[PDB]
Write an enzyme that holds these catalytic residues in place. Sequence first.
Site, PDB file in Angstrom:
ATOM      1  N   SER A 104       4.388   3.425   8.228  1.00 35.54           N
ATOM      2  CA  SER A 104       3.922   2.336   7.332  1.00 35.54           C
ATOM      3  C   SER A 104       5.007   1.735   6.453  1.00 35.54           C
ATOM      4  CB  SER A 104       2.758   2.801   6.462  1.00 35.54           C
ATOM      5  OG  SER A 104       1.678   3.176   7.281  1.00 35.54           O
ATOM      6  N   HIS A 163       0.820  -1.199   0.000  1.00 37.38           N
ATOM      7  CA  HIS A 163       0.000   0.000   0.000  1.00 37.38           C
ATOM      8  C   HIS A 163       0.859   1.256   0.000  1.00 37.38           C
ATOM      9  CE1 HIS A 163       0.348   0.660   4.485  1.00 37.38           C
ATOM     10  NE2 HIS A 163       0.252   1.911   4.076  1.00 37.38           N
ATOM     11  N   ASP A 180      -0.579  -7.252   2.117  1.00 44.14           N
ATOM     12  CA  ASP A 180       0.079  -5.929   2.083  1.00 44.14           C
ATOM     13  C   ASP A 180       1.595  -6.102   2.233  1.00 44.14           C
ATOM     14  OD1 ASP A 180       0.497  -3.175   2.023  1.00 44.14           O
ATOM     15  OD2 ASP A 180      -0.340  -2.810   4.029  1.00 44.14           O
TER      16      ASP A 180
HETATM   17  C1  GS5 Z   1      -8.605   1.680   9.313  1.00 42.66           C
HETATM   18  C2  GS5 Z   1      -7.432   1.980   8.366  1.00 42.66           C
HETATM   19  C3  GS5 Z   1      -7.836   1.916   6.891  1.00 42.66           C
HETATM   20  O1  GS5 Z   1      -7.775   2.966   6.265  1.00 42.66           O
HETATM   21  N1  GS5 Z   1      -8.243   0.726   6.315  1.00 42.66           N
HETATM   22  C4  GS5 Z   1      -8.752   0.746   4.939  1.00 42.66           C
HETATM   23  C5  GS5 Z   1      -8.031  -0.327   4.106  1.00 42.66           C
HETATM   24  O2  GS5 Z   1      -8.110  -1.623   4.721  1.00 42.66           O
HETATM   25  C6  GS5 Z   1      -7.621  -1.713   6.066  1.00 42.66           C
HETATM   26  C7  GS5 Z   1      -8.229  -0.615   6.948  1.00 42.66           C
HETATM   27  N2  GS5 Z   1      -6.770   3.278   8.633  1.00 42.66           N
HETATM   28  C8  GS5 Z   1      -7.430   4.503   9.059  1.00 42.66           C
HETATM   29  C9  GS5 Z   1      -6.336   5.578   8.908  1.00 42.66           C
HETATM   30  C10 GS5 Z   1      -5.017   4.792   8.925  1.00 42.66           C
HETATM   31  N3  GS5 Z   1      -3.885   5.461   8.244  1.00 42.66           N
HETATM   32  S1  GS5 Z   1      -2.508   5.893   9.040  1.00 42.66           S
HETATM   33  O3  GS5 Z   1      -2.857   7.048   9.821  1.00 42.66           O
HETATM   34  O4  GS5 Z   1      -1.435   6.019   8.072  1.00 42.66           O
HETATM   35  C11 GS5 Z   1      -1.978   4.694  10.167  1.00 42.66           C
HETATM   36  C12 GS5 Z   1      -1.291   3.486   9.793  1.00 42.66           C
HETATM   37  C13 GS5 Z   1      -1.024   2.802  11.018  1.00 42.66           C
HETATM   38  C14 GS5 Z   1      -0.375   1.562  11.190  1.00 42.66           C
HETATM   39  C15 GS5 Z   1      -0.208   1.033  12.495  1.00 42.66           C
HETATM   40 CL1  GS5 Z   1       0.579  -0.505  12.705  1.00 42.66          CL
HETATM   41  C16 GS5 Z   1      -0.663   1.710  13.646  1.00 42.66           C
HETATM   42  C17 GS5 Z   1      -1.311   2.942  13.486  1.00 42.66           C
HETATM   43  C18 GS5 Z   1      -1.490   3.485  12.175  1.00 42.66           C
HETATM   44  S2  GS5 Z   1      -2.251   4.947  11.835  1.00 42.66           S
HETATM   45  C19 GS5 Z   1      -5.442   3.408   8.447  1.00 42.66           C
HETATM   46  O5  GS5 Z   1      -4.721   2.542   7.966  1.00 42.66           O
END
Ligand code: GS5
Lengths: 51, 234
Positions: free
Chosen positions: B185, B42, B88
Amino acid sequence: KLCSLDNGDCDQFCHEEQNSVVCSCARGYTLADNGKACIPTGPYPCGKQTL
Amino acid sequence: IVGGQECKDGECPWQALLINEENEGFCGGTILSEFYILTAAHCLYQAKRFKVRVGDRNTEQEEGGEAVHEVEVVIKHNRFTKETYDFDIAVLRLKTPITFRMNVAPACLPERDWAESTLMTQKTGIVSGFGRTHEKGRQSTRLKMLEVPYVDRNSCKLSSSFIITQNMFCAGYDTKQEDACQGDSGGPHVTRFKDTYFVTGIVSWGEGCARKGKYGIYTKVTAFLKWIDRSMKT
Ligand SMILES: C[C@@H](C(=O)N1CCOCC1)N1CC[C@H](NS(=O)(=O)c2cc3cc(Cl)ccc3s2)C1=O
Ligand SMILES: [Ca+2]
């Protein structure tokens, strides 16, 4: 028992073959004379913090 | 990384930072060998064109160990899906080989059965990166590392509003204010065994950062050992 008793005494990978522990090591390491310890073959081996 | 500590000299040598046109970090990586970087699939849908930086601990000065590398081939898992973040995972082949030194070295790949029964049953893993310092903050100019407990698979599923596939795992804290975060990430989740560090996951996703009742979700590297071996061969 075996690999469940303190990792079979291995430094790295432990595997059970017919009531017997078999140790191995990641790439870049070779198994020591005692068939347990893993010896780095060259400098900057994987998994080690640099000093 | 929300919480944790700075990586001190020589402590997180397998960290890689993916950088865009503005020499700006947007994702992490893990050094696997002189030619290969492991990252999250991703992450490839986040910059038109990027390079890889290694050997850096403070983005605001030159400590002399820094090295930038161009990517020759991007190897993305073909079963990756944007909708759930399942599969991923990606490997990058570099145009020039990484020259190992202080602050620059690879993490070890484990064998699947031993990692799952011995590494993944350890109390904690270690995640690191230059991502946000808190949900709403800026990214860190200092590389950080954080010790994260392995989280029971069952609780993790209860806590999650999104699907947890067989290709994912959970780590972090129920309430304590420590977690991975935005920008971390594609970064390394490693586990320590007898002073040797083995790759156990890749930073994948989360419902915010450090929110009460939510955990960090990582790609289950051990499910992908054969795939990584193949990719590293061409
Ligand atoms: C719920 C999830 C999401 O967007 N999904 C859609 C695709 O399929 C999985 C869930 N989500 C919400 C915002 C978030 N983005 S982020 O702020 O870059 C983020 C990545 C990440 C990884 C980890 Cl390990 C902890 C905290 C966070 S904080 C994220 O991945
Ligand atoms: Ca620097």
